[PDB]
Design a protein around this ligand. Structure first.
Ligand SMILES: CCCCCCCCCCCCCCC(=O)O[C@H](COC(=O)CCCCCCCCCCCC)COP(=O)(O)O
Ligand SMILES: CCCCCCCCCCCCCCC(=O)O[C@H](COC(=O)CCCCCCCCCCCC)COP(=O)(O)O
Lengths: 431, 44, 62, 54, 126
C-alpha cells in the first residue's frame, strides 16, 4: 500500500492495487458548495447532473465505461471506471466530453430537461428525508452569513433563476489546472498513467480561482421547524469542532467514539459498553442516536443527532446526554479510552480499505488538494495509540466546558425547552 | 482486574471527586466561616 | 422564502464575539450578587437570634 | 484569556468564594460607614462633649 | 438483603459435611413445623418479598401454569387469615410438595446482575 504524487504542470496521484479487478480514473477540483454565493447556489449540483445525463452516459456505455460524480462543501469529482485493460479509453472520454467540448452538453434541449429533474429531487428531499435535512439546517444556523452555510444541493428558490450563462461563468473561475488533481485507483500503475497524459498535452486553463473574503465563524443559535403532523421528533446539536490540519484532529474523533451510535431494535446494540445507555433504556428515551466529528478546511462541528417517538420526555434525553459530556473534563476513566481506541481503528480501517475504487478516488483526491500528500493508515494508527486520558481532559476543557451550542429540530418538538435551559447544562455547578 | 465496586460509591470515582472534597468539605467549612460570628468564639 | 435564509440579527450582534470575554463579565455580575446576598442573609439571622439573649434590665442585676 | 478558570469555574471554590469574600466584607464595610457617620456628626457626640466637660 | 447466592453457599457447605448435617438438619425440621405457613396452604417461596428488581425478573420468567397456582394459594391464605381459622387438615401442604420452585430463576438473575456490575467498574492493563 503506497501512494505516489508527481507534478509536471499537472498534479497526478495514484494508489496501485494489483489484486483489484477494475480501475478508476478521474479529476477532482478544489471548489465545493462553500465557493458559491446565495444567488448561484446549486450550480455545482447542476454540473454533476449534466455530466451524468443520458446522452453522455450512452457514449460511455458503448465503450464499456461507467460514470460517477460527488458534490461536497470543499471539493467535487468526476470519475470514469472501466476494466483494467481499457484505461486509455477512459482517459480519452474525460478529454473529449469534459475538457475540450462543452457546447454538446450545454444545448438548450439538454439543459431544460436536466433542470427539471434536479428540481424534483430537491423537492422530494425537503419533504421526506427528515434526518438529513435537519443536519443541513444545523450547518445553516451555526455558520450564518458565511460561506460554510450554503446547502450542497441548493434551494428551490435559487435553482429556478439559473441559466446556461451561470454555469459557464462558474466553470471559467474554478475548473482550472491549479485547482485540479488527476487521480487513479484500483488496478493501474503510476508510470502508465503519467505517460498516457504526457503522450498528449492536456491543460485546462492558466490562472487562479477567486478568493472569498469572509472566513468561517461559529455562532451560537437555533432554528425550529415544528410539524405536528409528523410521527417523530428529529434533533441535532453541536459545538464548534476541529478543521483539517488540526493537531487535535484524532483526539476529537476518539471523543465521539466514546459515546458512539445506538439502535434500540438491534439486540447487540443494546449491550455496548457505553454508560449513557443505562439512563436511556430505563424509560426508552429514543429510537437511535449517533455522534460525529466533522472537519472542513476552516472549521468543524462536534455533536450528535437523534430520533424519538417519546415526545413527552425529550427534556430528559437532552439532559442525560449533556451530563455525560461533562465527564470528559472531570472523570473519564482509562478503560473507556482503551475501548474507544480499538473501535476507532476498526472504523477508520473499514473506511479506507473497502473494495470500491470509486470511494478510494474521492478520498485520495480530497486529501492531496489540501495537504499536498496523503497520510498512510499505518501512521494514523500510531497517533491514535499515543493518546492518553490527560489529552482527552485537556481537549474537552477547551472545546466542551461552558461553550456555546447550535440546535436544529423538526417534527413534534414542543417538549424541547428553550436555549438557556440547554446552554446551562454545558457545565456542572459541582466543579 | 477489578475490585470492590462500592455499589455506587465507586472509588475509581471517589478520588475522581474527592480532591475537590478538600474544597467541598471546604465549601461548607467556608460556610460556617460566615454564619457563626454574631457572638464571640474563636477556634483554629 | 427559503427557510435556509436566516433573518437579519446585525443590530444586536457584537463586532467581535470573543467567547472568553462575554462569559467573564456575565459571571462577574452573578458572582457579585451571590456574594452580597450571603452577607445580607447572615446578618439577618444574627439580628433575630441575638434578640433572645438577656435584656438590658436583666444584665443590670448581674 | 482565562479569567473564568478558577475565579468562577471551579464550583467547590466558587460557592466557596461566594462565601469566602463575604466574611472579610462585613468588617471593612462596618468600619468605613461608622467612620463616615461620626465625622459627619462631629462636635455633637458624647465623646466630643466629655472632652471639654472634664 | 442477604442474597440467595450467599444463603446457598452457607447451606450447601453444611449439607455436605456429615457431622454438621446431623446437628443442624433436625433443628431445621422443627423450625419449619413451628413456623406454620403450611397450615395456611403456602409453600416457602410464596413468602419471599417481591418488591425488588431481581424478584420481578424471576416472577416474569415463571411458566404460566405455575403462576396461576401461586395466585390461588396467596388468595386462599388471605381469606383464611381474616376468618382467624386454619385450613382443614387434608388441605395442608405436605413436606414432599414444599419444593423450591422459584429458586433456580432467582439464582440465574442474580448471577447476570453480578457479571454486569463487574464489567461496568473494571480495570485494564497493557
Ligand atoms: C417562589 C417564587 C420565587 C421567588 C424568588 C426567590 C429567590 C430565591 C431563589 C434563588 C434564585 C437563584 C437560584 C440559584 C440557582 O440555583 O441557580 C443555579 C445557578 O447558580 C449559579 O451558577 C450562580 C449562583 C447564582 C447566584 C444568584 C444569587 C441569588 C441569591 C438569592 C437572593 C436572596 C433571595 C442553577 O441555575 P442554572 O440552571 O441557570 O445554572
Ligand atoms: C425575614 C426578614 C426579611 C427582611 C426584609 C428586608 C427588610 C429590611 C429590614 C432588614 C432588617 C434585618 C437586618 C437589619 C440589619 O441590621 O442588617 C444590616 C444590613 O444588612 C442587611 O440585612 C440587608 C440585607 C437584607 C436581606 C437581603 C436578602 C438576604 C436573603 C434573604 C434573607 C433571609 C434568610 C447589617 O447590619 P449589621 O450586621 O450590623 O446588623
Amino acid at each position: 500500500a503506497e501512494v505516489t504524487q508527481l507534478s509536471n504542470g499537472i498534479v497526478v496521484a495514484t494508489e496501485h492495487n494489483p489484486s483489484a479487478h477494475t480501475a478508476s480514473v478521474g479529476v477532482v477540483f478544489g471548489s465545493g458548495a462553500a465557493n458559491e454565493n446565495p444567488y448561484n447556489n446549486g450550480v455545482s449540483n447542476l454540473w454533476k447532473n449534466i455530466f451524468l445525463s443520458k446522452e453522455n452516459s450512452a457514449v460511455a456505455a458503448k465503450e464499456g465505461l461507467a460514470l460517477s460524480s460527488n458534490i461536497s462543501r470543499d471539493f467535487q469529482s468526476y470519475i470514469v471506471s472501466s476494466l483494467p485493460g481499457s484505461t486509455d479509453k477512459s482517459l480519452d472520454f474525460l478529454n473529449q466530453s469534459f475538457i475540450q467540448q462543452k457546447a454538446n452538453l450545454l444545448s438548450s434541449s439538454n439543459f431544460e430537461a436536466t433542470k427539471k429533474s434536479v428540481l424534483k429531487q430537491v423537492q422530494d428531499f425537503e419533504e421526506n428525508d427528515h434526518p438529513n435535512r435537519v443536519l443541513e439546517h444545523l450547518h445553516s444556523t451555526a455558520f450564518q452569513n458565511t460561506p460554510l452555510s450554503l446547502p450542497t444541493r441548493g434551494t428551490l428558490e435559487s435553482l429556478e433563476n439559473l441559466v446556461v450563462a451561470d454555469l459557464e461563468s462558474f466553470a471559467n473561475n474554478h475548473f482550472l489546472n491549479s485547482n485540479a488533481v488527476v487521480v487513479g485507483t484500483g488496478n493501474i500503475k503510476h508510470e502508465d498513467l503519467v505517460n498516457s497524459i504526457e503522450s498528449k498535452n492536456l491543460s485546462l486553463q492558466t490562472g487562479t480561482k477567486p478568493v472569498l473574503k469572509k472566513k468561517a465563524a461559529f455562532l451560537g443559535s437555533e432554528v425550529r421547524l415544528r410539524d405536528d403532523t409528523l410521527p417523530k421528533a428529529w434533533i441535532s446539536l453541536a459545538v464548534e469542532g476541529e478543521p483539517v490540519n488540526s493537531p487535535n484532529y484524532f483526539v476529537a474523533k476518539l471523543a465521539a467514539q466514546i459515546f458512539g451510535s445506538y439502535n434500540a431494535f438491534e439486540p447487540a446494540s443494546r449491550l455496548q459498553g457505553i454508560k449513557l445507555l443505562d439512563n436511556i433504556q430505563e424509560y426508552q428515551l429514543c429510537d437511535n442516536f449517533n455522534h460525529f466529528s466533522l472537519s472542513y478546511k476552516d472549521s468543524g462541528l462536534w455533536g450528535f443527532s437523534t430520533a424519538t417517538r417519546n415526545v413527552t420526555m425529550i427534556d430528559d434525553l437532552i439532559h442525560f446526554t449533556l451530563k455525560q459530556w461533562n465527564r470528559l473534563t472531570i472523570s473519564v476513566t482509562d478503560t473507556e479510552v482503551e475501548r474507544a481506541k480499538s473501535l476507532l481503528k476498526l472504523q477508520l480501517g473499514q473506511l479506507y480499505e473497502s473494495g470500491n475504487p470509486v470511494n478510494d478516488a474521492n478520498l485520495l483526491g480530497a486529501e492531496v488538494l489540501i495537504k499536498g500528500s496523503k497520510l498512510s493508515l499505518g501512521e494514523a494508527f500510531k497517533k491514535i495509540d499515543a493518546i492518553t486520558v490527560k489529552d482527552v481532559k485537556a481537549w474537552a476543557g477547551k472545546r466542551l466546558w461552558d461553550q456555546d451550542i447550535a440546535i436544529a429540530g423538526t417534527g413534534q418538538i414542543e417538549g424541547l425547552l428553550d436555549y438557556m435551559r440547554i446552554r446551562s447544562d454545558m457545565s456542572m455547578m459541582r466543579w | 482486574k477489578t475490585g470492590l465496586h462500592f455499589g455506587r460509591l465507586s472509588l475509581r470515582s471517589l478520588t475522581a471527586y474527592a480532591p475537590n472534597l478538600m474544597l467541598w468539605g471546604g465549601a461548607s467549612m467556608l460556610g460556617l466561616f460566615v454564619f457563626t460570628e454574631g457572638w464571640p468564639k474563636f477556634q483554629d | 422564502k427559503s427557510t435556509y435564509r436566516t433573518p437579519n440579527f446585525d443590530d444586536v450582534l457584537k463586532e467581535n464575539n470573543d467567547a472568553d470575554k462575554g462569559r467573564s463579565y456575565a459571571y462577574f455580575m452573578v458572582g457579585a450578587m451571590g456574594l452580597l446576598s450571603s452577607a445580607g442573609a447572615k446578618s439577618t439571622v444574627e439580628t433575630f437570634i441575638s434578640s433572645m439573649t438577656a435584656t438590658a434590665d436583666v444584665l443590670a442585676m448581674a | 484569556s482565562s479569567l473564568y478558570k478558577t475565579f468562577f469555574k471551579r464550583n467547590a471554590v466558587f460557592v466557596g468564594t461566594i462565601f469566602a469574600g463575604a466574611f472579610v466584607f462585613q468588617t471593612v464595610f462596618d468600619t468605613a460607614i461608622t467612620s463616615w457617620y461620626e465625622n459627619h456628626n462631629k462636635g455633637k457626640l458624647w465623646k466630643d462633649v466629655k472632652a471639654r466637660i472634664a | 438483603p442477604q442474597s440467595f447466592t450467599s444463603i446457598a453457599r452457607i447451606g450447601d457447605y453444611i449439607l455436605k459435611s456429615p457431622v454438621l448435617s446431623k446437628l443442624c438438619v433436625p433443628v431445621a425440621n422443627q423450625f419449619i413445623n413451628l413456623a406454620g405457613y403450611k397450615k395456611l396452604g403456602l409453600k416457602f417461596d410464596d413468602l419471599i418479598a417481591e418488591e425488588n428488581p431481581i424478584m420481578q425478573t424471576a416472577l416474569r420468567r415463571l411458566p404460566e401454569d405455575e403462576s396461576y397456582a401461586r395466585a390461588y394459594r396467596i388468595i386462599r391464605a388471605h381469606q383464611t387469615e381474616l376468618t382467624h381459622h386454619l385450613l382443614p387438615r387434608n388441605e395442608w401442604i405436605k413436606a414432599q410438595e414444599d419444593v423450591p420452585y422459584l429458586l433456580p430463576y432467582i439464582l440465574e438473575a442474580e448471577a447476570a446482575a453480578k457479571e454486569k456490575d463487574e464489567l461496568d467498574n473494571i480495570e485494564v492493563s497493557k
